[PDB]
């Protein structure tokens, strides 16, 4: 198999399939068979080919599985194509406008300085249980309008639900049933007393019960592990490249135009939602079947060698222009904006505080996975 080694050194075996096999027939995780796609060209294309569906009901019957979850969730923007994609996206896309994002700046500030506040001036954290994580699921919880008082039930929910022990599901089971039980009391107590959230504004265009479940959900999951990981990433990528975290330290109004450079080169997702033929589609001189399940790789894309030279170089200098990281087409990042602002932000603070900032170790802790770029912990001295 040209893919031998794909989730121990993907970016090796990405290599070798945009010469060798760069639509290449795959065994997934769950065993089920997939189409990995890894050259540049394919990927952006297949992004915004309106014949490759990212609803399942387009799925060969018996060859697609999946997760498990209630029918309310499988109302889901990547679950869904035209018409219904385009309606329920146009409505929260109001949220998301750089203009209604900016305003979140001082906040989402504040909510790093204060993390930043518990590392005090010298020693040791893991910038992943500290910062990385934290910081997104505060942002969710403020965008939505989560009370503080259920915070830490919220976390305790949504932690095991992020990479779901594959041994021990029960924990993941009662996680999707709490927050279930949670966002239908909230979506409850915001219609019966509106405050300034997302979810109060949802709730006036009041889109089916369903639907405002799965943005609550989507909302969440599209926006923490991704958000985790870039800023995990990129932390990483500056502590390899002394040079280019030089020029940052420097010049930290460089800050907002080198977020693109990190997630072209160490986006946190390998993989896009998988998609379905809605008939049988030629990708890259491939014949894909109807139904058959296609995994756009955005990593490979993004480190294609024929439209990025010099892939396996973090420059900022570069024109990251193109990169497929936040997607392409009618599912491009609904949070692209508030991804940008908080990776900012987060980047900006931990520079301006901790001059020394250093790793611990010699090598990274990185989570085997087909879809997801992360690491387990981020060991740093400062
Ligand atoms: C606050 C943070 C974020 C939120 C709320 C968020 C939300 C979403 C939502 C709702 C979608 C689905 C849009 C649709 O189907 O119409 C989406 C798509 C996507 N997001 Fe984000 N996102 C965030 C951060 C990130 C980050 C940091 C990354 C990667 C760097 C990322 C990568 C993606 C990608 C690749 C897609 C498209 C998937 C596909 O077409 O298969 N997101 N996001």
Same mark, same amino acid.
């Given at each position: ?5 794909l ?5 090796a075996?990405?290599?070798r ?14 065993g089920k ?10 990927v ?13 009901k ?9 997760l498990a ?18 309606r329920?996206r146009?409505?929260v ?12 700046r001082?906040?989402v ?24 994580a934290?910081l997104?699921?505060?942002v969710?919880?403020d965008?939505?309008?989560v009370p ?25 089971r009662?996680s ?9 009391g ?11 959230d997302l979810?109060s504004?949802?709730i006036?265009?009041?889109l ?21 990981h870039l800023?995990?990433? $990129?932390?990483? *990528? @500056? !502590? ?5 975290? +030089?020029?940052?330290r420097?010049?930290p109004? /460089?800050? %907002? ?8 080169y ?28 296609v ?10 060698p ?8 973090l420059?900022?200098?570069?024109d990251a ?5 936040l ?13 940008r602002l908080?990776?900012?932000? $987060?980047?900006? *603070? @931990? !520079? ?5 900032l +250093?790793?611990?170790?010699?090598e990274?802790? /990185?989570? %085997?996975?087909?879809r ?10 400062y």
């Amino acid at each position: 198999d040209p893919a031998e080694g794909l989730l121990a050194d993907p970016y090796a075996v990405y290599d070798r399939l945009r010469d060798t096999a760069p639509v290449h027939r795959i065994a997934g995780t769950d065993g089920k068979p997939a189409w990995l796609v890894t050259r540049y060209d394919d990927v952006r294309e297949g992004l915004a080919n309106p014949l490759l569906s990212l609803d399942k009901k387009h799925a060969l019957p018996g060859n697609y599985r999946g997760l498990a979850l209630p029918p309310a969730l499988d109302a889901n923007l990547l679950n869904m194509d035209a018409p219904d994609h385009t309606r329920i996206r146009r409505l929260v896309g109001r949220a998301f406008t750089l203009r209604r994002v900016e305003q979140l700046r001082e906040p989402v500030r504040e909510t790093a300085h204060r993390l930043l506040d518990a590392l005090g001036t010298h020693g040791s954290t893991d910038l992943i249980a500290s910062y990385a994580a934290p910081l997104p699921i505060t942002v969710i919880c403020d965008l939505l309008g989560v009370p503080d008082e259920h915070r830490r039930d919220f976390r305790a929910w949504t932690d095991p639900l992020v990479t779901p022990d594959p041994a021990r599901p029960d924990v993941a089971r009662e996680s999707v049933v709490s927050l279930l039980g949670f966002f239908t009391g909230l979506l409850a107590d915001k219609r019966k007393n509106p405050a300034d959230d997302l979810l109060s504004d949802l709730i006036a265009v009041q889109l089916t019960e369903d639907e405002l479940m799965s943005l609550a959900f989507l909302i969440l999951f599209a926006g923490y592990e991704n958000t985790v990981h870039l800023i995990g990433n $990129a932390v990483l *990528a @500056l !502590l390899r490249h002394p040079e280019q975290l +030089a020029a940052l330290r420097e010049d930290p109004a /460089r800050l %907002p135009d080198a977020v693109g450079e990190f997630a072209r080169y160490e986006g946190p997702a390998l993989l896009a939602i998988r998609r379905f033929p809605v008939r049988d589609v030629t990708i890259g001189g491939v014949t894909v079947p109807a139904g058959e399940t296609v995994l756009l790789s955005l990593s490979a894309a993004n480190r294609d060698p024929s439209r990025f030279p010099d892939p396996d170089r973090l420059d900022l200098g570069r024109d990251a222009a193109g990169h497929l990281a936040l997607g392409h087409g009618v599912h491009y990042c609904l949070g692209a904006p508030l991804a940008r602002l908080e990776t900012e932000v $987060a980047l900006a *603070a @931990l !520079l301006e505080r901790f001059p020394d900032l +250093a790793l611990a170790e010699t090598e990274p802790r /990185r989570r %085997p996975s087909l879809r997801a770029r992360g690491l387990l912990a981020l060991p740093v001295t400062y």
